[PDB]
């Protein structure tokens, strides 16, 4: 049996905002502001590919 | 009477202090404390729940 979801859910980040964690405990260590050219300036330390 | 007088008191009325009922200061309600967190435990156990 095959059934694909959309979960809609909070995600929380502290300041200096270099990682976010949604409320399932998804820790995700990318900026949740890194637009894709300020790298710079946001961390990302996810998975590239 | 009208030879007048002297006013020889030489003033020294000292104010007395005044009452001051000091406030409880709260700079951060407890809502911001509790909001204050990447990690909450009550989402993540419901979560898991
Ligand atoms: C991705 O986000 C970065 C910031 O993390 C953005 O860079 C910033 O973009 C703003 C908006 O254009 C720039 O402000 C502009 O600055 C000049 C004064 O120098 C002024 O002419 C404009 O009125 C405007 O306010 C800002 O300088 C720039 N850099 C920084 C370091 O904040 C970037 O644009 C975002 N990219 C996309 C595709 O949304
Ligand atoms: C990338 O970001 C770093 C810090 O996040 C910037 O380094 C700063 O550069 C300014 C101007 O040269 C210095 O005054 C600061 O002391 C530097 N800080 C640190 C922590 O190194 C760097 O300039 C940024 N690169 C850009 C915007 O191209």
Redesign the interface.
């Given at each position: 049996n095959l059934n694909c979801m959309v979960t809609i859910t909070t995600a929380?980040?502290?300041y200096p905002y270099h990682?976010?964690?949604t409320?399932?405990?998804d820790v995700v260590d990318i900026s949740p502001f890194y637009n894709g050219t300020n790298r710079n300036a946001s961390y990302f330390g996810e998975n590239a590919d | 009477s009208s030879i007048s007088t002297v006013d020889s008191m030489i003033a020294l009325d000292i104010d007395p202090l005044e009452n001051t009922d000091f406030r409880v200061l709260e700079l951060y309600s407890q809502k911001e404390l509790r909001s204050?967190?990447?990690?909450?435990l009550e989402?993540?156990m419901r979560?898991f729940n």
């Open positions: 929380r980040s502290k990682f976010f964690a409320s399932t405990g | 204050s967190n990447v990690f909450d989402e993540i979560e």
